[PDB]
Design an enzyme around this catalytic site. Structure first.
Site: not given
Ligand SMILES: NC(=O)c1ccc(S(=O)(=O)N(Cc2ccc(C(F)(F)F)cc2)[C@H]2CNC[C@@H]2NCc2ccc(C(F)(F)F)cc2)cc1
Ligand SMILES: [Cl-]
Ligand SMILES: [Cl-]
Ligand SMILES: [Cl-]
Lengths: 99, 99
Positions: B25-27
């Site tokens: 999850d890059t967010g």
């Protein structure tokens, strides 16, 4: 480009004739943008995660330019704390995770 | 590997000797795992999600393997929709976004 993850992967996008800063978010199924006007029909939707759920408006077939790559897809509009580019648009610009 | 985003980027992780499924999850700034037993002392941490902020437990210097790549770092424990591997460990394993 290659974007490292030392800091949030924010990029400039163009949507509905406006420039906005948004987060490239592989954990998001959908794209979610802060309150703004978009043309066309919409339907309500609930989305959520840690902290709880928010209500958004779903607009389909919206064009967005992300780092000079044009893509079309669904955009959700609502009280998100950060503008989020989700997988539905990341795929269209050919974005991958690599390690 | 190179992982495309047509589906959720789910991978197998190993933590506490157990295999679990987690989302790349890059967010997410941080790594958040569903309730489990981890060693050592914890510290309080507030993380902001789509629908608000919640309190989680912060454990430091935890051994965790992600898609076969060994990492050691901060793991938060709390009520999350899915196990989340966030930027703190994605950076450790050398994960980048590319398009
Ligand atoms: N600080 C931190 O580490 C952290 C911050 C935020 C979050 S988060 O809000 O829970 N979170 C991760 C998430 C992962 C998976 C899921 C679920 F599986 F349910 F779909 C929901 C949510 C955030 C972090 N990255 C993706 C998600 N963005 C908000 C969001 C939620 C739902 C949509 C939708 F549904 F429209 F696609 C679009 C955007 C987690 C951790
Ligand atoms: Cl779409
Ligand atoms: Cl506490
Ligand atoms: Cl860490």
């Amino acid at each position: 480009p290659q974007i490292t993850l030392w800091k949030r992967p924010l990029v400039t996008i163009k949507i509905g004739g406006q420039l906005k800063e948004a987060l490239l978010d592989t954990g998001a199924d959908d794209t979610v943008i802060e309150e703004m006007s978009l043309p066309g029909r919409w339907k309500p939707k609930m989305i959520g995660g840690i902290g709880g759920f928010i209500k958004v408006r779903q607009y389909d077939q919206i064009i967005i330019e992300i780092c000079g790559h044009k893509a079309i897809g669904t955009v959700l509009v609502g009280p998100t704390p950060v503008n989020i580019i989700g997988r539905n648009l990341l795929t269209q610009i050919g974005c991958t995770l690599n390690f």
